[PDB]
């Protein structure tokens with residue numbers, strides 16, 4: 001049995017850490033909601 | 040009513056108290072990913088939130104009303120993942136999305152790796168609008184994780 005708990009406001013943070021790449025990937029989405037890579 | 044904001048989704052059916060995901064309360068509707076709740080009802084204090092809409096293929100579900108989140112990545116600007124990891128304080132991470140290219144169009148994707156229980160954390164634009172939810176993704180050639188920016192449709 002699941003319950004929810006507030007964790008914060010939804011707000012842009014001005015001096016947030018910046019990280020992560022920006023890959024462009026060919027993918028397929030199946031009927032079960034799973035993404036898979038195309039190659 | 041229950042305050043707007045980002046929420047942990049918890050269960051006590053497993054060992055101790057376990058965070059299975061995250062979601063967004065906006066305009067009286069709770070938004071999370073289908074694989075977090077499987078469509079089950081949720082408790083909010085002494086109140087009950089009943090599922091209203093969901094779709095396994097989109098991996099989304101809304102409670103108490105229809106999906107409300109309609110902002111979209113602009114395809115150019117950096118975004119922020121408001122990550123809410125299990126047992127850890129909510130934290131904003133800024134990133135330039137990549138792209139999932141599919142036969143039915145392109146969507147943004149964020150190459151950030153967090154525990155499974157972070158599923159449903161919101162991704163925001165520079166105006167603070169939720170442009171989608173984190174946690175439905177792929178593992179790429181080098182083993183790293185990339186999540187779609189998964190957004191619903193507002194009726």
Ligand SMILES: N=C(N)N[C@H](CCCCNC(=O)[C@H](CCCCN)NC(=O)[C@H](CCCCN)NC(=O)Cc1cccc(CN)c1)C(N)=O
Pocket residue numbers: 032033034035036037074098152153154155156157158173174175176177178182183184
């Ligand atoms: N593998 C990683 N380095 N990171 C992921 C980050 C998970 C963030 C939240 N999202 C999830 O837990 C969804 C649930 C299922 C949603 C399905 N609609 N998960 C995923 O999207 C992917 C889907 C892959 C589809 C491929 N067709 N699943 C995983 O990754 C599991 C995984 C895969 C490889 C290795 C590990 C190592 N424990 C873990 C992890 N499992 O820790």
